[PDB]
Amino acid sequence: RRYQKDGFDLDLTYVTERVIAMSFPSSGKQALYRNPIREVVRFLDTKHMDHYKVFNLCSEKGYDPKFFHYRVERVMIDDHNVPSLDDMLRYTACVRDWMAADSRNVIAIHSKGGKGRTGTMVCTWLIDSDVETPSQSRYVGYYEIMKNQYNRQLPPRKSLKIKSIRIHSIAGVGKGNGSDLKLKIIVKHELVFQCVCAKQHNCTVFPDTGSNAVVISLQDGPIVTGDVKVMFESSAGLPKGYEDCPFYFWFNTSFVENYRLFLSREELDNPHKPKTWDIYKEDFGVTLSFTEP
Amino acid sequence: RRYQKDGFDLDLTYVTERVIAMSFPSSGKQALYRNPIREVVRFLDTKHMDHYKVFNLCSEKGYDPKFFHYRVERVMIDDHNVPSLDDMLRYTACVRDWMAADSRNVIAIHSKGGKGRTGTMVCTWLIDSDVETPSQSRYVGYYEIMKNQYNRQLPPRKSLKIKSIRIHSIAGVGKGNGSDLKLKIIVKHELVFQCVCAKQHNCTVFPDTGSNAVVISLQDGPIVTGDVKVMFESSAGLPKGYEDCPFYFWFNTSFVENYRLFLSREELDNPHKPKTWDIYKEDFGVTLSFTEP
C-alpha cells in the first residue's frame, strides 16, 4: 500500500498513527524503482518536524545519520533472519523512550528487502505496546512470552547442550537415506558446529526406517546460549530458498522446555512456503534434543 | 598496488606478512571495477585455509558473514571519519587474540571508500604490535598514547563542556565577518548541539579583528564525553570537501590537556588538502575552549 497522498510516491506503510513502515531510502542511480532518500526525508519532515526516529533494521546497508537530522538507529538484522532478543529489548526500550519524549513522536521502520525485518520489528512493537519466515513468527512469540511472563527482560539464562537431531518424515527428501544433510550451528555470527553426514566424521547417522527418522547422534555438541541458528545444507539438489539453504532454524535456547525442541513442517524456515509442499510432506519436521551441562 | 600474482586481479595490499589491506568485496553488478566477493574469497581461501579473519570497517554497507566462513567482524567506522577509541581497543584486542590463536592466522582489512579507514586501522595494529583525513592520524596518535602510557586502556575518563570556539585568521574565509559558520556537535551519532552564527541565537559572535579572531561564546555547551565530532556548516560558498562540509573535527575529550584544544590549519579536516590553500591561510585554525563541570 504505497503512500500516494499529497503528491508522494514512496513505498510507505503508515501501520499506526504513531508508527510508520517503509522500504530502504536509497540514493544514486536507485531511486527509479525504490524510495529516494531525499524525497522520503522531505515527506517525513513536512509531516513530523523533529519528531521522528528512523530505524534502519539493515545489517547490510546504511546511508548516513545526517539525512534524518541525526536521528537514526541501526538494528543489525540479517535478511530473512531474526534479531537477538537483546536487540529486540533494546529496540523496544529506545522506542518507548522516544515515545516518552512527547506525545507526537512517530517512528519510521524500514529494511532493504521485503517487509520481513520491518514486519517483524513492527509487529514486535505492536504487541509490546498492546512477517515472512516462521523464525520471525517464533521470535515474536519469544518476545510475547518475555513481555507477559519475564516482564520486558531476558529469560532465566539457560545454557543448553544439543546432543542429537531427529528428522521426521525423511522419505522423499534427500538421496533416500538421509546421509546428505549438512549442519551449521551459528551463535552471534560464529559457526560453533558443522558436520557432514555423507562422510560421517563429526556426526553419526542412525536411520530408523520404521518411523522415518534419520536421527543423527551429535557428539560433543556446543553449549549454546541465547539465540541459535541451525541451517541444513544439502548436496542432493534440495529446493534451496531463503539465504540459499534447504531449511534453517532460529531459536532462543532460554525458551526450550524439557530439553526438547520439535519444529513442524510449517515452522522449518523455507519449507513453510506452499510452493515446496511436495518434498516435505505434512508430517515433516526436525526435533532437537538438548542436554543440561 | 594491486595483487597481480597467481592469476589474480584483486585490489589487495599485503601490508605485512600477517596483515592484509584491500578494498570492499562487492557483489552483483559491481565486480567489473571493484573486488568480486567470490574471487577474493577464493584467493584468501587458497592462501590461508581456515586461518584468517576478515575485518569489515564499513558502517554503511556489509555483505554476509557466510562468504568468509563466518569469520568476519564489522567495525562501524563512517567514511572519512574515525573509529571510537573503545572500538579501536576492541579491534586491537580481537586482532591480538586472533594472532595468539595460531602462528599462521592472518587478518583481512577493507573499507568501501579509499584507504582511509583501512589505513587507519592497519596503522593502529602496526603501532600496537611494534590515512586520508588528519583526524584519523590524530586517532592513531591517541592509540599510541594509550598503548604506551595508559597501557592499552582508556585514559582517565574526562568529561568537559565546550565554552567557546575560537577561529584563527578569518580574513578571507566567509562573508568577512564570520557570521556564516554553523556548528554541529556529534557524539555517538547524536547531534548534541547546533548553532547558527548569522541568527545569533544559540551562540554569540565576538569578532576580534585585531587578532583576526571571531571567537564565538558557546553558551551552555554540551557536556561531551569520549569521542566528539565538530563540523562547521556555512552558507557563503565555502569549498565543501569531505562529508560535504567546510571543515570538521574528530577528537577525544579525555586527551585534552590544560582544558584547551587548538587545531592548526593542517589538521582541520578538509583545509588539510593543499588544493584549498587559498581561503584558509597558514595561520588559520580553530581553538576548542573547555570547562570542567
Residue numbers in the entry:
A (entry chain A), B (entry chain B): 192 to 321, 349 to 511
Which passages does the manuscript contain on this structure?
Voltage-sensing phosphatases (VSPs) dephosphorylate phosphoinositide (PIP) signaling lipids in response to membrane depolarization. VSPs possess an S4-containing voltage sensor domain (VSD), resembling that of voltage-gated cation channels, and a lipid phosphatase domain (PD).
Compared to Ci-VSP, Danio rerio VSP (Dr-VSP) with the active site cysteine mutated to serine (C302S) showed better protein expression and stability. We therefore incorporated Dr-VSP (C302S) into nanodiscs for the study with cryo-EM. The dimeric interface in Dr-VSP buries 744.5 Å2 of surface area and involves 21 residues from each monomer, among which 4 hydrogen bonds (E251/G253, G253/E251, Y261/E461, and E461/Y261) and 5 hydrophobic interactions were observed. A similar, albeit smaller, interface is observed in Ci-VSP crystal structures. While diffuse density was observed in the expected position of the nanodisc and TM region, these features were not well resolved in the final map, suggesting flexible attachment in the resting/inactive state. Cryo-EM on Dr-VSP yielded both a high-resolution dimer of the cytoplasmic domain and a low-resolution monomer structure in a nanodisc, which provide structural evidence that a full-length VSP can exist in both monomer and dimer forms.
